[PDB]
Write a protein that binds this ligand. Structure first.
Ligand SMILES: Cc1cc2nc3c(=O)[nH]c(=O)nc-3n(C[C@H](O)[C@H](O)[C@H](O)COP(=O)(O)O)c2cc1C
Ligand SMILES: Cc1cc2nc3c(=O)[nH]c(=O)nc-3n(C[C@H](O)[C@H](O)[C@H](O)COP(=O)(O)O)c2cc1C
Lengths: 194, 191
């Protein structure tokens, strides 16, 4: 509810990297049921209003959906190329799908769906991810879905950071700060050796 | 394997076609911690190890990832190339080569990596202990010939590779997998 102390740093990184579309791309690591890590790029879609949670979208049919359901803890690594800074953020994921697990967050899911472009919504109508490639281009050109009402395989994914490591390569010689949230939701920070 | 893996051409093309971006050689390495939680951080890609398909990186023995990898030497990299809009995910086992006696056959490779670094890259290995509370950052330059004990060469040997091209019809995705005979298969898959 109060802004986390690293929010200004993130805002300054986003602003100074705004010329690069890809500065909003970050890597989300999860753990598989078999204990091995998984890592893939997602698009950052802003913070959820009145919170410090980061928003992403994903398909319920993707592998990460089941990984997250079994172990919701993730760590993102986010590198900003124009300013040579990295944020690592670890915390719990919430996956809001069409199931009834998070009814209180359906409005957030619906809002996200509606805020997307047509192109972004259209991808949720593509064939089943990871299966043998459908060779006909038609399967990838479905009619747009309802732009008001999310499709059942659309998920809003939230990350609630409880630990953030910010590394600035343009320092004296480099600066590194660790932020941690305790059980009372209070943040602490400390400068640490790179 | 000693034969080039079938994804090596694709990596070569990506590296070439993104050569104007220094940061196209930065990638993110995910590991698992002893408590079961993931960890993810950027590293610099420093080429393939000669006569292999293994990727080279460097790291400090004092870093948290070093203990993580010693306990669970399976990692997944995610590598995004911004000008060609393509992603490689690569999973497999890591080898950490330090000054200890565990990989004597790879000491020559560790020494060569050290020698190939810039002076600036070597100097970091003389910095204070990573992660502890902050002239310490301007130590005498390390010997450029002989690696310091906290220098590690880190190798990743991929067993599975997922290559996604966002500039396709509409996107292309290929999965490559290595079997226990060290043979690679590939398959076009839905994005
Ligand atoms: C730049 C870029 C942006 C991406 N954005 C997303 C995204 O926001 N959500 C998503 O689920 N996948 C996104 N992907 C695709 C994922 O990286 C991955 O291929 C897909 O989600 C399947 O991952 P999974 O098998 O681990 O579930 C993006 C890929 C690239 C390279
Ligand atoms: C662009 C960039 C390149 C980096 N290159 C390396 C590197 O090659 N090796 C390394 O150990 N850390 C590298 N780092 C620092 C790591 O991201 C991380 O802060 C450090 O290794 C500590 O990680 P750990 O605490 O998980 O061990 C790099 C960071 C950035 C942003």
């Amino acid at each position: 509810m109060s802004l986390a102390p690293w929010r200004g740093a993130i805002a300054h990184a986003l602003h100074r990297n705004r010329s690069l579309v890809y500065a909003r791309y970050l890597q989300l690591a999860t753990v598989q049921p078999n204990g091995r890590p998984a890592n893939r790029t997602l698009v950052f879609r802003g913070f959820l209003e009145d919170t410090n949670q980061l928003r992403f979208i994903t398909d319920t049919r993707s592998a990460k959906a089941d990984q997250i359901q079994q172990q919701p803890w993730a760590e993102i690594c986010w590198y900003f190329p124009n300013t040579r800074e990295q944020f690592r953020m670890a915390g719990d994921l919430t996956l809001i799908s069409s199931d009834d697990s998070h009814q209180d967050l359906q409005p957030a899911r619906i809002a996200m769906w509606q805020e997307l472009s047509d192109a972004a919504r259209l991808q949720f109508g593509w064939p089943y991810p990871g299966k043998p490639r459908i060779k006909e281009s038609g399967a990838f050109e479905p009619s747009p879905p309802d732009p008001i009402e999310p499709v059942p395989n659309f998920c809003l994914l939230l990350l609630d950071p409880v630990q953030v490591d910010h590394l600035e390569l343009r320092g004296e010689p480099q600066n590194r700060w660790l932020y941690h949230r305790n059980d009372q939701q209070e943040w602490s920070s400390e400068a640490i050796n790179p």
